Amino acid sequence: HPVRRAAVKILVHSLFSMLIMCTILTNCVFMAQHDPPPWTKYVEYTFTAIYTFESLVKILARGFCLHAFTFLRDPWNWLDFSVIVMAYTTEFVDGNVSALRTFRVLRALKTISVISGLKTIVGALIQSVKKLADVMVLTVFCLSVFALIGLQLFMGNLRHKCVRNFTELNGTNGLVWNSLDVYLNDPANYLLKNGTTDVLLCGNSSDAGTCPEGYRCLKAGENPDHGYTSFDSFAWAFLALFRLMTQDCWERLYQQTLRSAGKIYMIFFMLVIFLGSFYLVNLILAVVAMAYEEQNQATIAETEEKEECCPLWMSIKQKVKFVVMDPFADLTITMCIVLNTLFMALEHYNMTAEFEEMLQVGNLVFTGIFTAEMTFKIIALDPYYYFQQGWNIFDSIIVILSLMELGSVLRSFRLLRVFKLAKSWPTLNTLIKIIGNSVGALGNLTLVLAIIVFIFAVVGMQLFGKNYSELRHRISDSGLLPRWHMMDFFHAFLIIFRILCGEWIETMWDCMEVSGQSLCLLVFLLVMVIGNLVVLNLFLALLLSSFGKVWWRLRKTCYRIVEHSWFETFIIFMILLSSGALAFEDIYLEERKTIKVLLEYADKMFTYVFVLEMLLKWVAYGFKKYFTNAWCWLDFLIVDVSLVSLVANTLGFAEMGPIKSLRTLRALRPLRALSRFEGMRVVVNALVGAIPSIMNVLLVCLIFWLIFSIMGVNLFAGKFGRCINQTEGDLPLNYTIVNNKSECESFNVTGELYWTKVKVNFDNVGAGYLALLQVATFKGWMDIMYAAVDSRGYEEQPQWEDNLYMYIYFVVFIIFGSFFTLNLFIGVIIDNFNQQKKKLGGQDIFMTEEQKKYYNAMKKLGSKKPQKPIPRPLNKYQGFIFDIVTKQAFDVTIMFLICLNMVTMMVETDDQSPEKVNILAKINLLFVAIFTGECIVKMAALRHYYFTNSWNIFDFVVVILSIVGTVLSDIIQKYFFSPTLFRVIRLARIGRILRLIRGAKGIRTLLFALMMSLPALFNIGLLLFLVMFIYSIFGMANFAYVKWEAGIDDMFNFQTFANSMLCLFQITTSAGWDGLLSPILNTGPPYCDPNLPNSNGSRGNCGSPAVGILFFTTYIIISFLIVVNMYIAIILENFSVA
Ligand SMILES: *[C@@H]1O[C@H](CO)[C@@H](O[C@@H]2O[C@H](CO)[C@@H](O[C@H]3O[C@H](CO)[C@@H](O)[C@H](O)[C@@H]3O)[C@H](O)[C@H]2NC(C)=O)[C@H](O)[C@H]1NC(C)=O
Ligand SMILES: *[C@@H]1O[C@H](CO)[C@@H](O[C@@H]2O[C@H](CO)[C@@H](O)[C@H](O)[C@H]2NC(C)=O)[C@H](O)[C@H]1NC(C)=O
Ligand SMILES: *[C@@H]1O[C@H](CO)[C@@H](O[C@@H]2O[C@H](CO)[C@@H](O)[C@H](O)[C@H]2NC(C)=O)[C@H](O)[C@H]1NC(C)=O
Ligand SMILES: O=C(NC[C@H]1CCCCN1)c1cc(OCC(F)(F)F)ccc1OCC(F)(F)F
C-alpha cells in the first residue's frame, strides 16, 4: 500500500531521526524552565504534535492492529506510548492537583532510543546491576547486622543533651515549667555547642563529653540535627549505617556518637569503617569491574571473530628553505614553554607595579618568540603541514589567540601553551588519552550520565520548587534563600552534582525538612544508587581502556650475638618500650612529676642501648655490609639525631631554637619498627617500590592543577577577603554597610571591623594548590565555593550570589581533576601493583612467608567432597526423626523461623513500653526454645551431627550461649543488676542472625573472600597504625594547644594520645580534614592569640601553617595510597576466589 510504503520510508530515513532529536532537545530546554510564560503552552502542543506524528509514522510503518502490537513489542516504544497518552490526558482532563505535569521528563529518555549507541550503553549498564545482586544482598545484610548492633548499643543514646540543672519543689507537680512538659519544649535553655548552632551532647561514662558547671545531662530531648540521625528505631539505624557505608559526612555521626556514649566505641566505628564501609564499597568496585571485564572480553571477543613576483618569490622560497632547513630546537622552545608556565605562575594577590610591568614585558617577549617559531617553521618546510598536522594547528591557534588577546576570563588562552609538553611525556600522553576517551569511545556513556543528571535535576526542581520557595524559612538560619535549593535549574543541577560527588545526606535533610520524607528519600536514594553506579561504570571503563687473632675472636663473638634471636627480641621490646615512652609525652607531664624523670632516664637508656647495638653492628658487619642496607641507614640517621640532641643537652647550648627544635624529630623513633617486623617490611617494599610511578603521575597532576590554579589566580585573587565584623563572625552586614576594603579601612574607627581572607583561598599558586586539593578531595570545599560564587569585585565585599555562574569553574575542575586525575592515579597505581605481582611471579603481595602458608591452607579449606554422606542410625525412632530432619525442607523451615526471629529483633526501639518488653521477652523465649529443639534433635540425628561440620558446631555454641543468655537475663534481679552489663548479654543475640550465612551462597563467598584478605589487610593496617602513631606523636608535640575551632573540639584534640589517635582515625578516611586544618592555618589575631600562657613553656595557641599543611597533605597522600593498597588486596582476593 502507498501509505505503508511512505511510512516505512519515513521510518527508515536518516533525517527524521535528526528531526526527533532536535525536537527532544528543544523540549528539554523548554522543560528546564521554572514558571514558564503562558506563551509556551502552544509550544507544548507543537511538541505533542511532533511526538504523536512520529508514533503514527511508526504504527503505520507497521500498518495493522497486529503491527501496532509489534510496534509495542519494542520495550523502548512503551515509553513513547505512555508519554503520548500522558500528554493527551494532561490536556484532556486535569480536585485538581496537577502533579502529573512532571511526567514529561520521560521524554528526555527518548534520546536513548533515538541515538544509535545510547541504548546499547544503557543495556550494557543494566547487566552490571544484575551482577551486583549478591553484593547488594550482602550489603543490606551487613547494614542490618551492624544496624542491630548499633541499635542495641546506642538505643536513643544520641538524644543526650546538656540541660541546665533540674529545680524540684515539693509543692505542685525562673522555673514556671513542669518537668517533662517544660524540658522537651525547653531547647533555648539547652546548651549550644560553641561556635555552632547545634545541641551539645553528653554522657554519664567517664569518656563522653564533660558538661560545664551548671549543666547536667539527661536522655530527655528531641533528637540531633533534624531528627534523622537518631540510632533508635532500627529504620533510622539502617539509615545512619547506610550513611556510614557511603561515608557521606560520617565524621559528624562519629563525633556525635563518641560525644554521647563514650570514646571507647571508636572500636565500633572503626570496625564499620574498615570492614563495612571500605570493604563493601571496594567489593561493589570489584564486581562492577568484573562484569565490565566480561563484557569487554565478550564484546572484544565477538568483534575478533569475523569471517611580489613569481621568480623572486620562488627563489626566495627555495633560499629560505635552505637557510632554515633544520630547526631541531624543540628543547629550546620547550624550555621557553616551561619558562612561560613559570612566568605566568609568578602571579599573586598584591603584585608590585614594577613586578606586573615585568610580567607584561615577558608576556610580549614570549608572544613574539612563539610567533617567530610559528613563522619560521611555516616558511621552513611546508605550509601544507601547518594545514594538516593538528599539532601545528593548535600551535597556530594559540599564536593567533595570544595576538587577539594582546589586541577575568581574559588570560584563559595563554594557559593553552602548557599542554604541548605532552608530546614527549608518556604519562601526560596517557592523561591526554584518558581525557580524549572521555568524549570518544566512552562518549556514549558520558551521554548516559549527562542525560541522567538532567532528568533528575528537572524532576527534583518541579517536584520540590514550590516547597523550597514557600517553606524556605524551615531550611535556612536567617531569612534568606538556601545555599543549596532546587527552585531554579542551575541549583537543581548543582544538587544532583553534589549527590554525584558523594555528599547526599546533608541536603536530603533539607529536602525532607521542606518537602516530605517519603518521596524525598525516594528520589535522593534513587539518584544516589543510579548516579553513583553510572559514575562507577564510567570510571572503570576509562581505567580499563587506559591500557691480631683477638680481632677474629671479638668479631666472631659479635656475629654470634647479633644472629642470636634473644638479642633481636631484646631490641624489639626495646623499641616497643621507646615508642611507648613517646606515647606518654602529652600535655599532662607537668602534673606527672615522677614519670617526667622516669622517662628522662628512659630516654638516656634508650639512646645508650641503641648506639651500643649500633657499635656492635659496626664492629661486626663491616662498613660495607652495614651501609648496603637502607634500614641500617634509617637506624643510623635516627641514632644520629638522638645523639646530637643528647650531646647538645649535656654540653650546654641547648633549649633555644635549634637545638631542641630538632627533638620533635625524635617522633620518628617508631620508624625502627619497619625494619624488624616481617609485615611492615614487605608492605613498605611494596609501597616505595612504586615511587617512580607515583612521582610521575603526581608531576602530571601538578602540571594540570597548575593550569587550574593559575586560572584560579586570574579569576579569584583578593576577591575572597570578606571584612566580617567582630561580634558575629560572619560576612559584614550587607554590601552597602562595607562594600570595599578601602571602606572597611575607613569604617574601622572602632577596632570592631576586620578585613580577613578565608583560610584556604586562591591568592598564589601555593594556596591555589591547597584550595584545589581541598575541592578535588571534597572535604572543605563548601567554603571555597561559597566564597568564590560570592566573589563580586577585586577587593569589594561579596554579595550573596553575584558571579553565580562560577560554580561552573569548580564543576569543570572537579570533573577534570578528580574524576580524571584520581582516575590516572588509581589506574597507574593499580597497574603498577599488577606488574609487581607478575614480576614476582608469585603473584601475591603484602603477605610474608608464613602468611603465604596461611593463605594456601585457607584456600584448601574450601574442600568440596564431603565424608561418608550420612549414616542411617539403624534405629526405628531415630530413623524416623532423622528422616524428618535430614530433608532439605527442614533447613528451609528453620531458615524462615530464624528470619522471623531477625524481624522480631528489628522491632524494638527505646522506651518502647513495658508490655512490649514482656511480649518481646516471651517471643525470645519461644525462639530460643525452638532453637534448643532443633539443637537436641540434630544432636540426636545419629550421633555426630553436632560435630561433623563447622556450621553445626557454630549452631551448637550459639544455642548454648542463647540458653545461658536467657537464664542469666531472668535472674538479673536476684544477684545484681547493671545498666551496661545487660547490654552485652543482650547483644550476643546477633549470633543467631549469623546463622543465615549457611543457606546463603553469595554472602558466604564474599565473606570468605574478606576472610582470605584479612592477613594482607592486617599487615597493611599494621603499617597504617604505625603511621597513625608517628603522626599522632608529631602532632601531639606540635599541634597541641591550638585554638578550638571547627574540627578540634574539647573531646577531639591533639592534646592527649587518645584524642590524637582518634582525630587521625577520622583523617585516615580523608574525612573532616578540612575541619582539622582550619585551626592550624590561622596565624595571628583576630582568631588566635599569639603569645598566651600554655601548660608547657612554649607560647601561643595558633598553629603553624607551614607545618600544618605539610602534616595534613602528606597524611592524606599516604593514607590514600595505603587504602589504595586496601582496594588492591580486596580486588585481587575477590577475583581469585570467585
Ligand atoms: C546517669 O545517672 C543519673 C543519676 O543517677 C541518671 O539520672 C536519673 O535518671 C532516672 C531515669 O532514668 C531518674 O528516674 C526518674 O524517672 C522517672 C520516670 O521513669 C521519673 O518520674 C522520676 O523523676 C525518677 O526519678 C532519676 O531520678 C535520675 N537521677 C538523678 C540523680 O537525676 C541518668 O539517667 C543517667 N544517665 C542517663 C543519660 O540516663
Ligand atoms: C571601593 O568601592 C567604593 C564604593 O562605595 C568606592 O567609593 C567611593 O565611594 C563613594 C561613596 O560615597 C562613591 O560615591 C564613589 O563613587 C566611590 N568611588 C569610586 C571611584 O567609585 C571606592 O572608591 C572603591 N575603592 C577602590 C580602591 O576602588
Ligand atoms: C581594625 O582596628 C583594629 C584595632 O584593634 C586592628 O587590630 C589590630 O590589627 C593589627 C594588624 O593590622 C594587629 O597587629 C594589632 O595587634 C591589632 N590590634 C591590637 C591587638 O593591638 C585591626 O587590624 C583593624 N583592621 C583593619 C582592617 O583596619
Ligand atoms: O575518584 C574519586 N575520588 C574522590 C575521593 C578520593 C578520596 C578522598 C575523598 N574524595 C571521585 C571523584 C568524584 O568527583 C565528582 C564526579 F567525578 F563524580 F563528578 C566522583 C567520584 C569519584 O569516585 C567514585 C568512583 F569513580 F570511584 F566511582
Ligand SMILES: *[C@@H]1O[C@H](CO)[C@@H](O)[C@H](O)[C@H]1NC(C)=O
Ligand atoms: C566552648 O567555647 C567557649 C567560648 O566562650 C569556652 O569558654 C568553652 O570552654 C568551650 N567549651 C568546649 C567544650 O569547647
